[PDB]
């Protein structure tokens, strides 16, 4: 999330893709941990062919033989997380999720009813204000001229300086709020 | 196996064209990846740009709502397959809710007229 | 009556002749007087008609909508002014005093003692309408919507009058209790058949059944507020209480010449229900649902059961409120956004708590509540047509099923989900904006409280 | 809800008690800047245990395409206070 | 919205306060009337048809 | 926006073909419009018919429910195909 | 390009002035515009109409007719009228052809 | 307000309790306490009530009308006497609703009172309620919308030809 | 923002000797506005 | 009394001026319709010695 | 009399007032979610007079309180029919509530927004108590349908969550499907019996009632999750649990049961009704019970639970005995309501963690939660003289000694052996075996608000079926001689069940190979009817309303027709005319022709 995908999944990506949605779709279907466990170093006794395959074409047909594999044995409801999409609370806390320009537009009484907070937010937006001219400036000398760009950004470079593209990840909500 | 369907479609891992790839399809995914970095940051850059007080003005979904509304007519071409699809759609349960609103109306007219229907305790009618 | 008509039409110094910080609150405050003063016309302690001269006449179908006219007025005047907030002092009087013209001469069209008086003054509405759609409408598309709603609507009502001087050199008299009352029975023959769709060709146009519906959404989109709201809640009905008036001339053609109209209501209703499940426009999506709502009731004056003409009235006065409520908060999420799709904006429950509380109400009166008058005017059309046929129970369950469907489907879309987070523009909701969906809404509820008012010319 | 919000040395300490109960890693070797490669030279599967070892410890999902890119205690500490947004 | 929410119940119940005990005042003090036959000579006047007394005011004084 | 960068007619030609591409934010190559059958489709390219289920659901959106990111072209039917409607995710059998 | 003014910007008129009703934005001339289509709007329009509506008397004749059946179905059982004829108008006054 | 010639209930038949277990019932306790909690005042405000409107006591008249010529006797062409004879027969239609409605309440309350056993002492009931149907189904049934003397008399005369034919 | 205005593209369609062109109209030449002909 | 006072508040004059212009108008038109007085039939009765007419 | 009927309008009346309360400035003062428990308290402790008197003398009351508005003939006077089914459900839903409130007091004190939760379910339980003292059928229909906009605004609490939007129209567009099915027995009713109310509509009996009747069996559907409309009931568990506990499970699930068992006397005479809902009640049973016995989600079991306990309800309501049916309702609330409430403990004991493979031992963890869910489960199975039996095996009885289908028989005792495998599910997975949850034990169920609405509930279920059944009295035929094979053949089943659900859940104990069969397919992915009808019905639903009703007539056809043809014709009219060369030899050629026709046309004329 935090990260960004790339053009392609790589060979190692997409095995140890396969080897998240076997563990997990294990102990989807083996419930207590004893058979979790015992089933899981099963799942090693299964990797152990996967580890010295030179030729990678015979390694693509191994991993589309596991992949119909998983396919076949995979769980019609997997394992899910509270917090995991598809889940039991994937964005259940949107009730909080209100972003940080929705507090510009507060009555003074409601500002005045929170003193240092909105003075500190002042001091946010100042150095939003006296960061973005040096922010925006780096992009554009960090771009590179060639028809290749990646998704990931830069960082600061310069000292003293903030990150470029900070505010959107800095003022996201909280995921457990109360 | 599992076979694909139009409704539950074959997954990107599980499909075949994932793993015969070439280097002119990586090249487009490549390509792929750099125009979605030229788009994700000129919505970034107007995203955390301060200046800005409006909102996005996606061009795209004005292209998508320009063409679901207002290109469609400008589009037509009068071919015979969407003339007489169109005709069907349009004409065909006219005609066959008429048939059956005459059907049942001058059966009920008829049984009224007959004396067969009897209408025992119908005040609002 | 004319103490409803002449002070409306002494409205027009009020505006023309104030200050223009104050042409908004002086004419807002009068023209709730105007309503105010148009609440006399519930004085019926019996069945004779009222009829104040022999210029206009009050009948108590009229009158919910004369008191639906008079209270659209300063609805109207409420949500003109943000939209006018840039433009100057001359046009915004001239939108004014068009609003208050064609409040005037609604007041005078719904007051008709005569058919002919009811066509100059039905076909008096087609000028300010247009001056404001075509003029204060903020797309391209307006000069295309103001000629497709202006030729519609004429090449329906030419054949009207054509009609109106026939029966009128056929028999005397075109006054609506006259030609109740003195009239014969027509003949089955052809030169009627052609009578019967002159004369009823042009209310077939003002309320959208398929064929002719394509003017609305057009002149819904390409509008203005207080036009948009105008054209859903009281001027597509006046060709609807023409509707109920002219076929007492001509009730014994029309259980032969219906059941084209009741057959293109209903898959036009369900074709337009269809229609909104795939709506990018928010305001055409209401557009549509009110081709929908009056396709039922197309059906319903096509039929001739007075059970038919209460669930009529009711859906007329329920459709009005609660499409202009619809309508309201289109210019609301306008207003905030400076677009109207739907997808573009979701999730504003979050920063909107009581803007979605009458988003709620009137797209859960859209969807029809039991209690409003919206699911007690489908609900008597319903025992209506299931009097006229016992198999059409299925297309109507079809279109209440695919009205809850758009109905939750434009809540669920624009009001509930994730926070669309890439606007600052969403200011919080205004006090005029809270108070006049509330004043919309409250005659609502007030109406679902007392319905003894509402229930039309016949029972 | 009940449960307490989570310090940064009690996470800290929470990780580290999960990575000392492996049964290929030293506890003396073990520290929170050592990298799971060439550090305590560990294999590619390893590293996605571990991350299933944060994913039944926490009770929350690392996606995949940070969970390939997380390689030492230190910033698997740092991810997953990131993901559940602590001030310390 | 609160300040809506206020209003609306201020100027709403600034009315809304001294009409409903008006209705409840002339219920008690005033109070309708029972029906009786017509009396022999006298026909009634367009007011005494009705049996609120409210109804009876604006329909003597108004209609 | 102009009657340039808004939609019209049909790709006859390659050079407008790229033209519309440059248009879409799309590539070149992967650019199949929908077939020239009178259906008022014109220019708009036609993405593969996946709904919004089967793209990541862990990267992050610039358009959150719909799954979507700036300037990606939108598909036709994506009020068909949004998460609250009918989903084409992969099935287990 | 032609000569053209730009596309002006939606300033934040909470921004302006924090008491803004959506009425014109001098202040006092919005507030007092608040006040004038509450009272005269909200007060003496809904209030006073709906003091007036519940108080129109016998509206389409129901009370009335209410009572003259109750008072025609006493009058019916006391003299041994049956309770609703099948023909409304008379057949001796009426002229079969 | 109650008269029983047009609402006759038959009087209540209650049995005596006579409790046979020596615990005693909490119901008749429970409605002795709230008799002299809740009713005792709230009979006093009724008779305050009824005190002062036996003060300030008006009287108001049922409104008679006059019978006109009927459309029977009334001209075609002359639009007066239509008119009157047209508002004769539309209060005669609104009283003869509320006259289908006194049956049905009749009906209704005879049923509830009658119970799961209503048959028996429902017969005269619905006797009187299939006449009244069977009256009005002859009177304004498929009259339209537009109700009016002269479509309830087209009613009435092809109905008398359809009984002059079948006689 | 602000509502639509005709631009350059719109006023000129108004702007030809006649408004709807065919194959025998599309020689018109637009009349000089004094009514003189060189 | 202020002159600008006065300028911006002979405005509110005109709708009630226009109410009471249109009840005076309507009751001119009530004088017109006479022509049926105290002769329908269902309120043809003996007028009372304090009134000349029926209704006014 | 008079006490009997303002006690009803007192529990309306307390009901009516925390939304009084709400909308006034007294919310940001007063402690309302203690407010509104007591409340709700004081309601049922008025709701227990009426139950008391109507258990003393046996009055049913017809109560029209307000004439509202006079159509025609119809009148539509606000009234509340007060009976064996109005008196027993408004105590049992107002006992039921007072748990609820005291629950959601506890359970929801994270959400800020409390207040608008605690007044949505208030607003809740004024429509589902409206549905339940409903004699005309105007509120009947306000009832019908206020619960339904009430269960939308109570599932779609978590505005955010996209799948609970989902579940949200499913619930929608399932309750509207029932609201076509009343829409088409009311209008039936209302014009060939010129009413709506109890007292005039049980005189239908003597006609052919069958297209009504088949309307409430649409309506019932509708309501009562069955198979052609269940999937709205196993998506409900994505809201909250105090809204799945009182809305989806007690209250809003059985009013398709209640509209038929306050619709006794017309559904006995008609035969072919009596079949179609026994036979589609047990295919809801079956459905409901095969589902649940390998699924996942707790709120999702106990879902299908009251789904598979609402099919056997509409078992009993068409095998006509409608008054055990609502025992049945008045008996399965408690329990049900108390393993939701349960389930709900476990949920913000172990935060949010819904699936049965990561949560366990719950009865050395929390043995007051544990405790109340072995006598909820054990009430759902059906041990003796507990509030389930004293339905349940009267149900059992009355299917072995009634003319039900063969199959209805044998689909019905394979269902309820499938209720005690589904029952050994959450006792298995939830309080048995070694423990599966994330390794932070923070365990809070210390709180009187949490200990007191489960106490009472239990207590509910412990002394409440026996004193239904024997303060009710006796208001069907119950027959006791069968034979002994098939008397207690109920336990017999019961335990065959427990029996054969711990012979199969001990085997995955065992270190062994787990097959991915189709029967596991079918019971773990919820039969495919979401999958199948939730794809295919909306992918040709939106896609005959894009490529035929708005693309194809709208947009371009009915354009092609009416205004653009004749606007075509106009323009090539137009520009066939004025299209001269601007010689005056052509146009005195063509004065000529036209001089010529003059001469002609007088030469004819
Ligand atoms: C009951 C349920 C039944 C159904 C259950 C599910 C059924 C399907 C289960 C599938 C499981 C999966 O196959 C697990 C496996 O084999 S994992 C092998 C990983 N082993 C390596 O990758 C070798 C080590 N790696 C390296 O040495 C470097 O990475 C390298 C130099 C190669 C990078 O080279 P380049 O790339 O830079």
């Given amino acids: 999330a935090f990260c960004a995908p790339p053009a392609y999944l790589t060979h190692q990506q997409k095995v140890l893709r396969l080897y998240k949605r076997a563990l997990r779709h294990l102990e989807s279907w083996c419930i207590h941990r004893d058979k979790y466990r015992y089933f899981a170093c099963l799942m090693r006794a299964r990797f152990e062919e996967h580890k010295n395959e030179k030729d990678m074409m015979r390694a693509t047909q191994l991993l589309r033989e596991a992949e119909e594999e998983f396919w076949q044995n995979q769980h019609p409801q997997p394992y899910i997380f509270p917090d995991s999409p598809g889940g039991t609370s994937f964005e259940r806390y949107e009730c909080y999720k209100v972003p940080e320009w929705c507090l510009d537009y507060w009555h003074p009484s409601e500002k005045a009813m929170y003193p240092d907070y909105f003075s500190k937010r002042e001091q946010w937006k100042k150095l939003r204000m006296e960061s973005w001219d040096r922010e925006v400036k780096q992009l554009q000398e960090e771009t590179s001229p060639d028809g290749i760009m990646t998704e990931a950004l830069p960082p600061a470079r310069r000292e003293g300086d903030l990150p470029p593209l900070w505010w959107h990840i800095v003022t996201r909500p909280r995921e457990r709020p109360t | 196996k599992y076979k694909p369907a139009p409704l539950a479609t074959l997954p990107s891992t599980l499909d075949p064209a994932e793993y015969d790839v070439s280097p002119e399809t990586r090249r487009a995914q490549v390509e792929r990846l750099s125009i979605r970095a030229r788009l994700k940051r000129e919505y970034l850059l107007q995203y955390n740009d301060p200046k800005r007080v409006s909102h996005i003005e996606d061009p795209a979904l004005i292209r998508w709502t320009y063409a679901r509304s207002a290109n469609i007519y400008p589009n037509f071409r009068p071919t015979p397959k969407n003339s007489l699809l169109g005709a069907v759609a349009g004409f065909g349960p006219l005609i066959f809710w008429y048939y059956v609103f005459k059907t049942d109306r001058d059966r009920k007219e008829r049984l009224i007229q007959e004396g067969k229907l009897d209408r025992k305790f119908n005040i609002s009618y | 009556m004319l103490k409803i008509i002449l002070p409306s039409l002494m409205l027009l110094p009020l505006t023309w002749l104030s200050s223009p910080k104050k042409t908004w609150t002086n004419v807002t405050s009068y023209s709730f007087l105007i309503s105010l003063t148009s609440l006399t016309l519930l004085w019926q302690t019996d069945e004779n008609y009222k009829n104040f001269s022999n210029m206009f006449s009050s009948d108590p179908l009229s009158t919910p909508l004369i008191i639906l006219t008079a209270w659209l007025l300063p609805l109207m005047l409420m949500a003109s002014q943000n939209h006018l ?78 009609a109106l001087i026939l029966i009128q050199n056929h028999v005397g008299t075109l006054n609506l209790m006259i030609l109740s009352f003195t009239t014969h029975t027509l003949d089955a023959s052809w030169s009627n058949n052609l009578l019967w769709l002159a004369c009823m060709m042009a209310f077939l146009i003002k309320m959208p059944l398929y064929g002719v519906h394509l003017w609305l959404p057009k002149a819904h989109v390409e509008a203005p507020i207080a036009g948009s709201m105008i054209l859903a809640a009281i001027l597509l009905k006046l060709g609807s209480y023409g509707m109920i008036r002219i076929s007492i001339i001509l009730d014994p053609l029309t259980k032969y010449m219906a059941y084209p109209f009741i057959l293109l209501s209903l898959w036009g209703m369900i074709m337009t229900s269809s229609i909104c499940l795939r709506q990018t426009d928010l305001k055409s999506l209401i557009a549509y649902s009110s081709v929908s709502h009056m396709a039922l009731v197309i059906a319903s004056i096509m039929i001739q059961t007075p059970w038919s003409f209460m669930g009529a009235t009711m859906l007329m006065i329920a459709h009005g409120l609660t499409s202009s409520l619809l309508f309201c908060l289109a210019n609301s999420n306008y207003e905030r956004i400076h677009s109207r799709t739907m997808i573009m904006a979701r999730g504003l429950q979050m920063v909107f708590p009581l803007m979605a509380t009458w988003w709620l109400m009137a797209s859960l009166a859209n969807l029809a509540l039991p209690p409003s008058i919206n699911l007690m005017g489908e609900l008597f059309i319903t025992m209506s047509l299931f009097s006229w046929s016992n198999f059409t129970i299925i297309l109507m369950g079809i279109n209440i099923i695919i009205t809850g469907m758009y109905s939750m489907y434009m809540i669920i879309t624009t009001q509930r989900g994730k926070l669309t987070n890439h606007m600052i523009n969403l200011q919080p909701s205004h006090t005029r904006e809270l108070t006049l969906m509330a004043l919309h809404m409250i005659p609502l509820i007030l109406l679902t409280t007392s319905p003894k008012l509402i229930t039309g010319l016949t029972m | 809800s009940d449960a307490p919000p989570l310090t940064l040395d009690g996470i800290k300490d929470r990780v580290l008690y999960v990575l000392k109960l492996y049964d290929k890693i030293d506890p003396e070797k073990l520290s929170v800047n050592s990298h799971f490669m060439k550090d305590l030279g560990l294999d590619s599967l390893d590293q996605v245990e571990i991350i299933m070892a944060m994913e039944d410890e926490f009770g929350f999902e690392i996606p995949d395409i940070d969970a390939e890119k997380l390689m030492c205690p230190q910033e698997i500490v740092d991810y997953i206070a990131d993901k559940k947004d602590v001030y310390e | 919205d609160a300040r809506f929410l206020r209003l609306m ?22 109070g309708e009337a029972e029906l009786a036959e017509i009396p022999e000579g006298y026909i009634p006047e367009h007011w005494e048809y009705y049996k609120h007394p409210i109804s009876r005011w604006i329909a003597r004084n108004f209609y | 926006m102009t009657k340039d960068m808004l939609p019209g007619s049909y790709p006859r030609t390659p050079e407008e073909r790229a033209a519309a591409a440059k248009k879409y934010n799309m590539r070149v190559e992967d650019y199949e419009p929908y077939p020239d059958d009178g259906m008022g489709y014109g220019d708009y390219p036609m993405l593969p018919n996946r709904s919004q289920h089967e793209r990541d659901p862990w990267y992050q959106w610039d358009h959150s429910e719909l799954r979507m990111n700036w300037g990606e072209p939108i598909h036709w039917d994506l009020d068909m195909y949004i998460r609250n409607r009918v989903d084409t995710s992969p099935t287990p059998v | 390009q032609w000569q053209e003014d730009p596309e002006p910007e939606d300033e934040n008129v909470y921004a302006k002035n924090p008491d803004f009703h959506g009425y014109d934005s001098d202040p006092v001339v919005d507030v007092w515009n608040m006040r004038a289509v509450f009272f005269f709007g909200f007060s003496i329009v809904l209030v006073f109409g709906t003091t007036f509506v519940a108080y129109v008397p016998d509206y389409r004749m129901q009370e009335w007719a209410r009572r003259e059946a109750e008072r025609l179905v006493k009058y019916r059982e006391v003299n041994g009228l049956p309770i609703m004829e099948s023909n409304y108008f008379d057949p001796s006054k009426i002229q079969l052809p | 307000s109650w008269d029983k010639d047009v609402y006759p209930e038959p009087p209540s038949r209650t049995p005596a309790p006579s409790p046979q277990t020596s615990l005693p019932n909490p119901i008749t306790y429970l409605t002795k306490a709230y008799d002299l909690v809740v009713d005792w005042p709230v009979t006093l405000v009724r008779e305050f009530i009824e005190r002062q409107h036996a003060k300030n006591r008006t009287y108001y008249y049922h409104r008679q009308y006059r019978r006109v010529p009927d459309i029977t006797e009334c001209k075609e062409g002359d639009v007066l006497c239509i008119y009157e004879a047209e508002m004769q027969w539309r209060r005669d239609f609104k009283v003869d609703q509320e006259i289908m409605n006194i049956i049905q309440e009749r009906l209704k309350a005879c049923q509830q009172r009658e119970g799961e056993n209503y048959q028996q002492n429902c017969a005269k009931e619905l006797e009187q309620f299939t006449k009244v149907t069977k009256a009005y189904q002859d009177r304004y049934l498929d009259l339209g919308a537009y109700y009016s003397a002269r479509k309830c008399l087209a009613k009435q005369k092809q109905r008398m030809l359809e009984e002059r034919k079948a006689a | 923002a602000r509502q639509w205005q005709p631009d350059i593209e719109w006023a000129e369609q108004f702007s030809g000797a006649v408004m709807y062109p065919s194959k025998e109209t599309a020689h018109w030449k637009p009349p000089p506005w004094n009514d003189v002909d060189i | 009394t202020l002159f600008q006072l006065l300028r911006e508040h002979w405005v509110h004059i005109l709708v009630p001026a226009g109410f009471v212009f249109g009840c005076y108008l309507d009751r001119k038109d009530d004088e017109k319709l006479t022509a049926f007085r105290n002769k329908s039939m269902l309120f043809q009765r003996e007028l009372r010695p304090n009134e000349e007419v029926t209704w006014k | 009399m008079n006490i009997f009927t303002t006690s009803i309008l007192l529990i309306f009346i307390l009901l009516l007032s925390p939304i009084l309360i709400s909308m006034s400035n007294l919310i940001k003062h007063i402690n309302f979610p203690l407010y509104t428990t007591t409340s709700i308290k004081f309601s049922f402790i008025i709701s227990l007079l009426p139950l008391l008197m109507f258990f003393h003398n046996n009055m049913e009351y017809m109560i029209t309180t307000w004439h509202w508005v006079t159509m025609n003939s119809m009148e539509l006077k606000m009234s509340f029919k007060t009976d064996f089914f109005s008196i027993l459900f408004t105590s049992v839903a107002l006992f039921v509530t007072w748990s609820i409130m005291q629950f959601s007091s506890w359970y929801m004190h994270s959400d800020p927004n409390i207040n608008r939760f605690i007044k949505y379910l208030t607003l809740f339980l004024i429509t589902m108590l409206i549905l339940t003292s409903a004699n005309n059928m ?125 619709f006794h006397p017309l559904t006995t005479n008609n035969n072919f009704i009596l079949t179609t809902m026994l036979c589609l009640g047990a295919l809801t049973t079956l459905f409901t019970a095969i589902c649940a016995l390998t699924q996942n989600d707790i709120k999702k079991i106990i879902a299908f639970s009251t789904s598979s306990q609402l099919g056997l309800m509409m078992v009993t309501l068409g095998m006509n005995q409608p008054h055990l049916a609502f025992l049945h309702i008045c008996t399965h609330a408690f329990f049900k309501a108390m393993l939701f409430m349960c389930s709900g403990s476990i949920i913000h004991s172990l935060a949010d963690e819904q699936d049965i493979r990561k949560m366990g031992n719950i009865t050395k963890i929390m043995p007051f939660t544990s405790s109340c869910l072995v006598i909820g489960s054990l009430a759902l199975t059906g041990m003796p003289f507990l509030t389930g039996f004293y339905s349940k095996d009267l149900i059992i009885e009355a299917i072995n000694t009634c003319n039900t289908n063969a199959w209805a028989l044998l689909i019905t005792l394979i269902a309820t052996s499938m209720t005690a495998m589904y029952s050994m599910r959450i006792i298995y997975f939830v309080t048995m075996t070694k423990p599966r949850f994330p390794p932070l034990i923070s365990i809070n169920e210390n709180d009187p608000d949490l200990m007191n609405p489960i106490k009472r509930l239990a207590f509910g279920s412990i ?55 189709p029967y596991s397919s079918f019971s773990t992915l919820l039969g495919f009817f979401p999958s199948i009808i939730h794809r295919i019905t909306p992918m040709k639903s939106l896609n005959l309303s894009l490529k035929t009703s708005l693309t194809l007539l709208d947009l371009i056809w009915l354009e092609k027709t009416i205004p653009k043809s004749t606007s075509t014709l106009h323009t090539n009219m137009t520009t066939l005319t004025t299209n001269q060369k601007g010689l005056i030899k052509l146009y005195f050629m063509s004065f000529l022709i036209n001089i010529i026709l003059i001469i002609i046309l007088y030469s004819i004329n």
Avoid: C
């Fill in chain 3, 85 to 162: 907030k840039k433009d100057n002092n001359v046009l915004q009087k001239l939108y004014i005093s068009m609003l208050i013209s064609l409040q005037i001469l609604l007041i005078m069209t719904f007051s008709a003692t005569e058919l002919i008086m009811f066509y100059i003054l039905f076909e008096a509405t087609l000028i300010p309408t247009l001056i404001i759609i075509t003029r204060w409408g903020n797309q391209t598309e307006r000069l295309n919507a103001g000629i497709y709603f202006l030729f519609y609507t004429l090449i329906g009502s030419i054949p009207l009058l054509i």
């Fill in chain 5, 9 to 30: 119940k201020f100027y709403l119940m600034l009315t809304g306060i001294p009409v409903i005990i008006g209705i409840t005042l002339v219920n008690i003090f005033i």
């Fill in chain 11, 138 to 262: 105007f509120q009947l229909f306000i009832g019908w349908e206020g619960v339904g906009i009430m269960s939308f605004l109570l599932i779609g609490w978590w505005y955010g969550r996209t799948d609970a939007n989902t579940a949200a129209l499913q619930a929608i567009l399932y309750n509207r499907i029932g609201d076509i099915g009343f829409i088409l027995a009311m209008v039936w009713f209302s014009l060939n019996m010129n009413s709506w109310e109890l007292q005039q509509i049980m005189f239908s009996n003597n006609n052919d009632n069958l297209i009504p009747l088949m309307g409430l069996l649409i309506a019932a559907t509708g309501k009562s999750a069955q198979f052609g409309l269940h999937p709205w009931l196993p998506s409900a568990m994505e809201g909250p649990t105090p809204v799945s506990a009182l809305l989806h499970s007690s209250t809003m699930v059985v009013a398709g049961i209640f509209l038929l068992v306050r």
């Fill in chain 11, 463 to 517: 002394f409440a079926g026996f004193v239904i059944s024997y303060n009710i009295p006796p208001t069907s035929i119950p027959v006791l001689t069968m034979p002994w094979f098939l008397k207690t053949t109920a336990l017999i089943i019961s335990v065959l069940g427990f029996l054969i659900a711990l012979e199969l859940n001990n085997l995955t104990m065992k270190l062994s190979m787990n097959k991915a069969n």
